[PDB]
Amino acid sequence: GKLPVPWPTLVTTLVQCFSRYPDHMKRHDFFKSAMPEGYVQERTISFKDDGKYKTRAVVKFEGDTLVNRIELKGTDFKEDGNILGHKLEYNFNSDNVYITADKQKNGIKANFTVRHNVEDGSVQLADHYQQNTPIGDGPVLLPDNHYLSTQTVLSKDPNEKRDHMVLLEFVTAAGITHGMDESASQGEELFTGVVPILVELDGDVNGHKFSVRGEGEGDATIGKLTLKFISTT
């Protein structure tokens, strides 16, 4: 099936454990430290002047594969807005994802606002609130404030008849202020080479049901993701 929302609006929902944390920041990489048991990642994504997505994902290893399984619920959309009206361009700008520790949840929160380019030259904002909570009981790394800086390119497979998205993405961590008295986790070691990825999303936006499957690989040493997503539907 043809997806009822634009592919760019699903990018952030469709594995921040593949971010590149430079050596001096390795003690701040919550995402890998939670592996292999993984974490729950929840967001509310508010499309300004339009509806919202609420998402809940479990991100963990199954065997050798890093799996991201998501339930997405979209509500309060305008059937002729930029989302359900398919008015967004097929590209994706850089973001800085600002992360803070959530000591009470033994996890993190993040906040950022995505700018989606509309075909008429206007902008559609997608304001993200995120919270991640480890599933396991073992120690995790709780970070000082910092951000992830992203770069993403979207393309198509000429041989693919189904509705789909080819994605390539690089993410680096930055922004840390070092102070006095400063492999940092076992989970980090699970990312030292190229790791296969599976993504499965089940979606319902204003009653329009859809699902997406993605496969590909991640190379956290360089912060790189290589995935193809297909709307299954």
mmCIF file of C-alpha atoms in Angstrom:
data_model
loop_
_atom_site.group_PDB
_atom_site.id
_atom_site.type_symbol
_atom_site.label_atom_id
_atom_site.label_comp_id
_atom_site.label_asym_id
_atom_site.label_seq_id
_atom_site.Cartn_x
_atom_site.Cartn_y
_atom_site.Cartn_z
ATOM 1 C CA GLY A 1 0.000 0.000 0.000
ATOM 2 C CA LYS A 2 0.766 3.659 -0.650
ATOM 3 C CA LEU A 3 1.646 5.243 2.647
ATOM 4 C CA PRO A 4 -0.992 7.645 4.043
ATOM 5 C CA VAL A 5 1.670 10.049 5.374
ATOM 6 C CA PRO A 6 4.871 11.367 3.792
ATOM 7 C CA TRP A 7 7.992 9.260 4.227
ATOM 8 C CA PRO A 8 10.010 12.169 5.703
ATOM 9 C CA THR A 9 7.566 12.346 8.612
ATOM 10 C CA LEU A 10 8.493 8.785 9.638
ATOM 11 C CA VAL A 11 12.316 9.162 9.499
ATOM 12 C CA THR A 12 12.847 9.935 13.172
ATOM 13 C CA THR A 13 10.525 7.112 14.268
ATOM 14 C CA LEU A 14 12.107 4.504 11.975
ATOM 15 C CA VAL A 15 18.138 3.454 16.340
ATOM 16 C CA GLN A 16 20.255 6.108 18.080
ATOM 17 C CA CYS A 17 22.558 3.383 19.394
ATOM 18 C CA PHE A 18 24.267 3.747 15.998
ATOM 19 C CA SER A 19 25.369 7.344 16.688
ATOM 20 C CA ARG A 20 29.098 7.982 16.680
ATOM 21 C CA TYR A 21 30.236 8.983 20.170
ATOM 22 C CA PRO A 22 33.814 10.330 19.943
ATOM 23 C CA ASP A 23 36.285 8.836 22.437
ATOM 24 C CA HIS A 24 36.055 11.769 24.825
ATOM 25 C CA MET A 25 32.285 11.287 25.087
ATOM 26 C CA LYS A 26 32.019 7.521 25.334
ATOM 27 C CA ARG A 27 30.943 7.726 28.959
ATOM 28 C CA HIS A 28 27.812 9.597 27.787
ATOM 29 C CA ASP A 29 26.426 6.982 25.365
ATOM 30 C CA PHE A 30 23.272 5.775 27.125
ATOM 31 C CA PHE A 31 21.916 4.032 24.035
ATOM 32 C CA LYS A 32 24.644 1.415 23.606
ATOM 33 C CA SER A 33 25.022 0.903 27.343
ATOM 34 C CA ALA A 34 21.446 -0.431 27.528
ATOM 35 C CA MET A 35 22.219 -3.230 25.064
ATOM 36 C CA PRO A 36 21.583 -6.073 24.564
ATOM 37 C CA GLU A 37 18.352 -5.935 26.599
ATOM 38 C CA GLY A 38 17.630 -2.568 25.031
ATOM 39 C CA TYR A 39 15.405 0.362 25.771
ATOM 40 C CA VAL A 40 11.904 1.636 25.283
ATOM 41 C CA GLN A 41 11.835 4.817 23.206
ATOM 42 C CA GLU A 42 8.663 6.942 23.381
ATOM 43 C CA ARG A 43 7.901 10.176 21.558
ATOM 44 C CA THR A 44 5.199 12.695 20.995
ATOM 45 C CA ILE A 45 5.746 14.418 17.659
ATOM 46 C CA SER A 46 3.581 17.524 17.331
ATOM 47 C CA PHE A 47 3.039 18.698 13.759
ATOM 48 C CA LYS A 48 2.307 22.333 14.362
ATOM 49 C CA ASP A 49 -1.108 23.454 13.068
ATOM 50 C CA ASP A 50 -1.875 19.785 12.546
ATOM 51 C CA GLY A 51 -1.967 16.407 14.333
ATOM 52 C CA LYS A 52 0.439 14.443 16.440
ATOM 53 C CA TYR A 53 2.163 11.076 16.390
ATOM 54 C CA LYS A 54 2.596 9.162 19.631
ATOM 55 C CA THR A 55 5.116 6.365 19.294
ATOM 56 C CA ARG A 56 6.416 3.580 21.480
ATOM 57 C CA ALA A 57 9.334 1.433 20.316
ATOM 58 C CA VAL A 58 11.338 -1.427 21.766
ATOM 59 C CA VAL A 59 14.956 -1.308 20.534
ATOM 60 C CA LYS A 60 17.015 -4.385 21.440
ATOM 61 C CA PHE A 61 19.148 -7.189 20.003
ATOM 62 C CA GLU A 62 17.572 -10.372 18.697
ATOM 63 C CA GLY A 63 20.473 -12.647 17.896
ATOM 64 C CA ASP A 64 22.967 -10.624 15.822
ATOM 65 C CA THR A 65 20.332 -8.096 14.711
ATOM 66 C CA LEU A 66 19.453 -4.742 16.236
ATOM 67 C CA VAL A 67 15.647 -4.598 16.026
ATOM 68 C CA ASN A 68 13.441 -1.497 16.316
ATOM 69 C CA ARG A 69 9.748 -2.414 16.649
ATOM 70 C CA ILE A 70 7.394 0.565 16.839
ATOM 71 C CA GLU A 71 3.713 1.243 17.425
ATOM 72 C CA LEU A 72 2.650 4.638 16.041
ATOM 73 C CA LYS A 73 -0.690 6.331 16.712
ATOM 74 C CA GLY A 74 -1.553 9.520 14.900
ATOM 75 C CA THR A 75 -4.482 11.719 15.864
ATOM 76 C CA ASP A 76 -5.981 15.103 15.221
ATOM 77 C CA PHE A 77 -4.702 15.384 11.670
ATOM 78 C CA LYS A 78 -6.252 17.568 8.974
ATOM 79 C CA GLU A 79 -7.210 15.407 5.959
ATOM 80 C CA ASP A 80 -6.011 18.305 3.714
ATOM 81 C CA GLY A 81 -2.993 19.354 5.832
ATOM 82 C CA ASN A 82 0.617 18.939 4.821
ATOM 83 C CA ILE A 83 0.790 15.394 6.209
ATOM 84 C CA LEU A 84 -2.346 13.609 5.037
ATOM 85 C CA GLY A 85 -2.293 15.814 1.926
ATOM 86 C CA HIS A 86 1.258 14.705 0.963
ATOM 87 C CA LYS A 87 2.617 18.258 0.598
ATOM 88 C CA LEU A 88 6.144 17.631 1.884
ATOM 89 C CA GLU A 89 9.334 17.499 -0.182
ATOM 90 C CA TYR A 90 11.395 14.313 -0.272
ATOM 91 C CA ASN A 91 14.420 15.453 1.750
ATOM 92 C CA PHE A 92 15.420 15.797 5.370
ATOM 93 C CA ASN A 93 17.402 18.609 6.972
ATOM 94 C CA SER A 94 20.019 18.337 9.705
ATOM 95 C CA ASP A 95 18.956 18.345 13.373
ATOM 96 C CA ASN A 96 20.660 18.770 16.709
ATOM 97 C CA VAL A 97 18.943 16.374 19.133
ATOM 98 C CA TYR A 98 19.483 17.748 22.662
ATOM 99 C CA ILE A 99 19.772 15.000 25.279
ATOM 100 C CA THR A 100 19.470 15.272 29.047
ATOM 101 C CA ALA A 101 19.667 12.608 31.727
ATOM 102 C CA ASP A 102 16.438 11.431 33.350
ATOM 103 C CA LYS A 103 17.926 10.170 36.580
ATOM 104 C CA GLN A 104 14.597 9.012 38.036
ATOM 105 C CA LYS A 105 13.854 6.807 35.011
ATOM 106 C CA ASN A 106 17.489 5.711 34.759
ATOM 107 C CA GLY A 107 17.383 7.000 31.173
ATOM 108 C CA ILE A 108 17.291 10.093 29.005
ATOM 109 C CA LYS A 109 15.014 12.645 27.454
ATOM 110 C CA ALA A 110 15.546 14.480 24.194
ATOM 111 C CA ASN A 111 13.969 17.452 22.473
ATOM 112 C CA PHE A 112 14.280 18.974 19.005
ATOM 113 C CA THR A 113 12.117 20.464 16.256
ATOM 114 C CA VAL A 114 12.255 19.035 12.718
ATOM 115 C CA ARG A 115 11.586 21.386 9.816
ATOM 116 C CA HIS A 116 9.838 19.582 6.941
ATOM 117 C CA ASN A 117 9.959 21.533 3.682
ATOM 118 C CA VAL A 118 6.549 22.018 2.065
ATOM 119 C CA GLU A 119 6.179 22.008 -1.724
ATOM 120 C CA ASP A 120 4.981 25.650 -1.794
ATOM 121 C CA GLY A 121 8.082 26.848 0.071
ATOM 122 C CA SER A 122 6.464 27.023 3.516
ATOM 123 C CA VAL A 123 7.686 24.901 6.429
ATOM 124 C CA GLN A 124 5.925 22.220 8.492
ATOM 125 C CA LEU A 125 7.387 21.942 11.999
ATOM 126 C CA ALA A 126 7.396 18.585 13.810
ATOM 127 C CA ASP A 127 8.194 19.241 17.463
ATOM 128 C CA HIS A 128 9.720 16.146 19.140
ATOM 129 C CA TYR A 129 9.597 15.193 22.796
ATOM 130 C CA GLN A 130 11.404 11.904 23.506
ATOM 131 C CA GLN A 131 12.048 9.695 26.500
ATOM 132 C CA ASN A 132 14.148 6.506 26.659
ATOM 133 C CA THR A 133 14.092 4.014 29.509
ATOM 134 C CA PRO A 134 16.365 0.908 29.744
ATOM 135 C CA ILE A 135 14.645 -2.454 29.813
ATOM 136 C CA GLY A 136 17.380 -4.277 31.755
ATOM 137 C CA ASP A 137 18.336 -3.838 35.390
ATOM 138 C CA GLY A 138 22.116 -3.619 34.738
ATOM 139 C CA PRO A 139 24.063 -0.407 34.971
ATOM 140 C CA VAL A 140 23.653 2.146 32.210
ATOM 141 C CA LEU A 141 25.467 5.362 31.352
ATOM 142 C CA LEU A 142 23.588 8.495 32.255
ATOM 143 C CA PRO A 143 24.952 11.362 30.205
ATOM 144 C CA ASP A 144 25.783 14.951 30.805
ATOM 145 C CA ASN A 145 23.850 17.306 28.572
ATOM 146 C CA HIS A 146 24.933 16.999 24.939
ATOM 147 C CA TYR A 147 23.434 16.691 21.462
ATOM 148 C CA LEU A 148 23.441 14.448 18.425
ATOM 149 C CA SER A 149 24.046 16.190 15.109
ATOM 150 C CA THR A 150 22.436 14.465 12.122
ATOM 151 C CA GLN A 151 22.674 14.359 8.324
ATOM 152 C CA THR A 152 20.263 12.338 6.179
ATOM 153 C CA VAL A 153 19.691 11.645 2.499
ATOM 154 C CA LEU A 154 16.569 10.076 1.023
ATOM 155 C CA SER A 155 16.405 8.293 -2.301
ATOM 156 C CA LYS A 156 14.600 5.565 -4.246
ATOM 157 C CA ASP A 157 15.509 2.111 -5.612
ATOM 158 C CA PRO A 158 14.754 2.251 -9.378
ATOM 159 C CA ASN A 159 13.923 -1.432 -9.371
ATOM 160 C CA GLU A 160 11.389 -1.197 -6.502
ATOM 161 C CA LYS A 161 7.696 -1.011 -7.492
ATOM 162 C CA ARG A 162 6.440 -0.838 -3.934
ATOM 163 C CA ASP A 163 6.165 2.376 -1.954
ATOM 164 C CA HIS A 164 9.527 2.653 -0.228
ATOM 165 C CA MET A 165 12.356 4.864 1.065
ATOM 166 C CA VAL A 166 16.109 4.392 0.735
ATOM 167 C CA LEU A 167 17.844 6.174 3.622
ATOM 168 C CA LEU A 168 21.433 6.958 4.435
ATOM 169 C CA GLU A 169 22.187 8.811 7.648
ATOM 170 C CA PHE A 170 25.209 9.919 9.696
ATOM 171 C CA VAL A 171 25.014 10.973 13.325
ATOM 172 C CA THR A 172 27.761 12.323 15.617
ATOM 173 C CA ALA A 173 27.527 13.245 19.296
ATOM 174 C CA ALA A 174 28.841 16.656 20.363
ATOM 175 C CA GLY A 175 28.339 19.476 22.802
ATOM 176 C CA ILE A 176 29.668 18.179 26.053
ATOM 177 C CA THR A 177 31.108 20.497 28.728
ATOM 178 C CA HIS A 178 33.888 18.653 30.569
ATOM 179 C CA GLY A 179 34.494 19.405 34.244
ATOM 180 C CA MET A 180 36.558 18.338 37.253
ATOM 181 C CA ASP A 181 37.138 14.748 38.383
ATOM 182 C CA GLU A 182 36.103 13.202 35.060
ATOM 183 C CA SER A 183 34.959 0.793 26.188
ATOM 184 C CA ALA A 184 32.950 2.674 28.676
ATOM 185 C CA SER A 185 30.190 -0.019 28.627
ATOM 186 C CA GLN A 186 29.897 -3.625 27.718
ATOM 187 C CA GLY A 187 27.006 -2.776 25.405
ATOM 188 C CA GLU A 188 29.269 -0.418 23.403
ATOM 189 C CA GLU A 189 31.291 -3.467 22.368
ATOM 190 C CA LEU A 190 28.301 -4.899 20.499
ATOM 191 C CA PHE A 191 28.632 -1.999 18.015
ATOM 192 C CA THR A 192 32.336 -2.150 17.119
ATOM 193 C CA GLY A 193 31.601 -3.562 13.701
ATOM 194 C CA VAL A 194 28.751 -3.524 11.075
ATOM 195 C CA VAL A 195 25.472 -4.687 12.634
ATOM 196 C CA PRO A 196 22.351 -5.806 10.734
ATOM 197 C CA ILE A 197 19.156 -3.873 11.489
ATOM 198 C CA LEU A 198 15.477 -4.777 11.270
ATOM 199 C CA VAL A 199 12.752 -2.126 11.694
ATOM 200 C CA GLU A 200 9.044 -2.915 11.969
ATOM 201 C CA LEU A 201 6.445 -0.197 12.354
ATOM 202 C CA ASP A 202 2.731 -0.603 12.816
ATOM 203 C CA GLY A 203 0.881 2.654 12.225
ATOM 204 C CA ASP A 204 -2.576 4.190 12.391
ATOM 205 C CA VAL A 205 -2.953 7.876 11.506
ATOM 206 C CA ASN A 206 -6.529 9.143 11.737
ATOM 207 C CA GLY A 207 -7.672 5.589 11.114
ATOM 208 C CA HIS A 208 -5.463 5.083 8.059
ATOM 209 C CA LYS A 209 -3.591 1.871 8.908
ATOM 210 C CA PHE A 210 -0.206 0.965 7.466
ATOM 211 C CA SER A 211 2.957 -0.890 8.259
ATOM 212 C CA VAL A 212 6.581 -0.468 7.265
ATOM 213 C CA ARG A 213 9.457 -2.935 7.268
ATOM 214 C CA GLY A 214 13.067 -1.784 7.051
ATOM 215 C CA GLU A 215 16.314 -3.668 6.718
ATOM 216 C CA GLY A 216 19.910 -2.737 6.399
ATOM 217 C CA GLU A 217 22.894 -2.125 8.623
ATOM 218 C CA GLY A 218 24.553 0.243 11.021
ATOM 219 C CA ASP A 219 28.205 1.140 11.579
ATOM 220 C CA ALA A 220 28.447 3.079 14.824
ATOM 221 C CA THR A 221 32.184 3.591 14.466
ATOM 222 C CA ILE A 222 31.350 6.086 11.692
ATOM 223 C CA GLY A 223 27.836 6.911 12.831
ATOM 224 C CA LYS A 224 26.329 5.476 9.658
ATOM 225 C CA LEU A 225 22.929 3.934 8.859
ATOM 226 C CA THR A 226 22.072 2.271 5.512
ATOM 227 C CA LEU A 227 18.385 1.158 5.371
ATOM 228 C CA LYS A 228 15.622 0.450 2.858
ATOM 229 C CA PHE A 229 12.047 0.746 4.070
ATOM 230 C CA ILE A 230 9.006 -0.732 2.315
ATOM 231 C CA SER A 231 5.390 0.000 3.088
ATOM 232 C CA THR A 232 3.946 -3.581 3.670
ATOM 233 C CA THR A 233 0.402 -2.472 3.553
#
